[PDB]
Amino acid sequence: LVPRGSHMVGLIWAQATSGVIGRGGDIPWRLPEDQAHFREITMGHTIVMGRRTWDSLPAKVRPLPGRRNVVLSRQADFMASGAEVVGSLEEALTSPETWVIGGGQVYALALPYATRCEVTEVDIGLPREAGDALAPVLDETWRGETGEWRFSRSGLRYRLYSYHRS
Ligand SMILES: NC(=O)c1ccc[n+]([C@@H]2O[C@H](COP(=O)([O-])OP(=O)(O)OC[C@H]3O[C@@H](n4cnc5c(N)ncnc54)[C@H](OP(=O)(O)O)[C@@H]3O)[C@@H](O)[C@H]2O)c1
Ligand SMILES: CCc1nc(N)nc(N)c1OCCCOc1ncccc1/C=C/CO
Numbered sequence: 574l575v576p577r578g579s580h581m582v583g584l585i586w587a588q589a590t591s592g593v594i595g596r597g598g599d600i601p602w603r604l605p606e607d608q609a610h611f612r613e614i615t616m617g618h619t620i621v622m623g624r625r626t627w628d629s630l631p632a633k634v635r636p637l638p639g640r641r642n643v644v645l646s647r648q649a650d651f652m653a654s655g656a657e658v659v660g661s662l663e664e665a666l667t668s669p670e671t672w673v674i675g676g677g678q679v680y681a682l683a684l685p686y687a688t689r690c691e692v693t694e695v696d697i698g699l700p701r702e703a704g705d706a707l708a709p710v711l712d713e714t715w716r717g718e719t720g721e722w723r724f725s726r727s728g729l730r731y732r733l734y735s736y737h738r739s
């Protein structure tokens with residue numbers, strides 16, 4: 574459970590088996606099971622994203638509904654209609670439960686404060702290319718639960734991981 578006086582920080586991302594999460598300003602696959610899982614985990618909570626992840630959402634869909642949207646930017650003139658733009662994790666992590674929803678820069682920024690990671694891994698061979706966004710690497714303070722391989726309606730294998738630490 575999450576006490577209302579606490580500040581719990583989780584990271585949620587989907588990756589190829591290579592660790593790639595983003596390429597050319599987008600996610601280089603689509604997986605409906607992952608979209609549903611992302612919604613199930615984050616609904617009702619604050620979501621924090623980097624400015625480039627805000628840019629990657631079509632204007633018509635943002636801010637993502639049912640969640641307080643917070644965008645990290647260092648640009649004093651960047652504005653996100655419907656959402657709050659802050660310049661640091663300190664300002665972004667004021668809710669009792671926050672999910673950092675990407676991308677690569679912001680996962681690495683938020684990892685020192687996080688105690689949970691929820692990962693979808695898609696079994697698509699997408700090797701790391703220059704400029705890709707990548708999943709954060711998790712050291713031995715993290716302990717993980719790895720689900721068995723499942724099979725999507727779209728014909729891709731995928732599996733879920735849940736990581737925790739103190
Ligand atoms: N597969 C997934 O789960 C997933 C999830 C989310 C995103 N993505 C993909 O990942 C890519 C985006 O990731 P990315 O690493 O390029 O960018 P990002 O992490 O989404 O955003 C980077 C921006 O965040 C701001 N920022 C970074 N560090 C900051 C700090 N310390 N303080 C304040 N603001 C800070 C900066 O904005 P300013 O430049 O405005 O200062 C920076 O340019 C896209 O391809 C996207 O589609 C994938
Ligand atoms: C559903 C993707 C996803 N999955 C997991 N597991 N964690 C995340 N942090 C995550 O990114 C959410 C922000 C980026 O969203 C999108 N970016 C590009 C194209 C489509 C979307 C989807 C929006 C809502 O379906």
Ligand SMILES: [Cl-]
Pocket residue numbers: 611612637638
């Ligand atoms: Cl969503």
Ligand code: NA
Pocket residue numbers: 585586587610611691692693
């Ligand atoms: Na996930």
